[PDB]
Amino acid sequence: XXXXXXXXXXXXXXXXXXXXXXXXXXXXXXXXXXXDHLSKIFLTISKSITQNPWNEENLLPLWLKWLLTLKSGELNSIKDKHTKKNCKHLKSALRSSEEILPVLLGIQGRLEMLRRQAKLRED
Amino acid sequence: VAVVLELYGNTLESSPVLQELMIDLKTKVRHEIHKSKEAQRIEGMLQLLT
Amino acid sequence: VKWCLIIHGGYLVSIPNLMSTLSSLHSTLKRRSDLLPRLLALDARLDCTINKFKTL
């Protein structure tokens, strides 16, 4: 309802995915995932997530999750011309974060290490 | 496990004991993930005293 | 291990060579730490099929 009208509007739109992103439901994220318009979603999704690896909203990465899990086979062969150039871009776009997730977990330890010694200064 | 997944996703939908085993394997893999988390954290925190 | 490192941290600052002392300790911490990307891969590897089957 919120997402179906946005799907008809993208069937002409990244603001449509941001506007159906006002729902934030995972069951709706699976149901609107099946209803090749999912590539018409992915053509905004791939660009928006490559432009931002650090977006702290959830429905665009979870929507990429439900798209890469629900549409896992056919997304490779929509096109081998112009989606896959961006696909060879996004492997570089994301795994930069994968390198520092061990380090970010390291400092995640290194913070509560000092939280606990400040609590020990309290007692 | 990964080659089993990419080969036998078509099998794993069909038998429910595979589904239950994948549920428990998900929990124990995430358990080892948090084990990896705590031993990553303790080694990173261990740099502070060095 | 955790509260040992919490309580005796200031003394453990004072000794210069910890990797002299905490070597097998560091080996255990790395040995669980090195398995992190394989497990992180396995999460998506499971969850492709997990989001495949429990709907249909």
Curated annotation (Swiss-Prot), chain B:
The entry's other comment says:
Present with 358 molecules/cell in log phase SD medium.
Subcellular locations according to the entry: Nucleus, Nucleolus
The shown residues of the full protein are: 463 to 512 of 513
Q: How does it assemble?
A: Interacts with snoRNA U3. Interacts with MPP10. Component of the ribosomal small subunit (SSU) processome composed of at least 40 protein subunits and snoRNA U3. In the absence of snoRNA3, forms a complex with other t-UTPs. This complex can associate with pre-18S ribosomal RNAs.
The record describes the protein's role as:
Involved in nucleolar processing of pre-18S ribosomal RNA. Required for optimal pre-ribosomal RNA transcription by RNA polymerase I together with a subset of U3 proteins required for transcription (t-UTPs).
Record-given protein name: U3 small nucleolar RNA-associated protein 15
From Swiss-Prot, chain C:
Question: Where, per UniProt, does this protein localize?
Answer: Nucleus, Nucleolus
Q: Which residue ranges run through the membrane?
A: none
Q: How does it assemble?
A: Interacts with snoRNA U3. Interacts with MPP10. Component of the ribosomal small subunit (SSU) processome composed of at least 40 protein subunits and snoRNA U3. In the absence of snoRNA3, forms a complex with other t-UTPs. This complex can associate with pre-18S ribosomal RNAs.
Q: What else is known?
A: Present with 33100 molecules/cell in log phase SD medium.
**Function (record text):** Involved in nucleolar processing of pre-18S ribosomal RNA. Required for optimal pre-ribosomal RNA transcription by RNA polymerase I together with a subset of U3 proteins required for transcription (t-UTPs).
Family membership: Belongs to the UTP5 family.
Entry protein name: U3 small nucleolar RNA-associated protein 5
Q: Which gene is transcribed and translated to give this protein?
A: UTP5
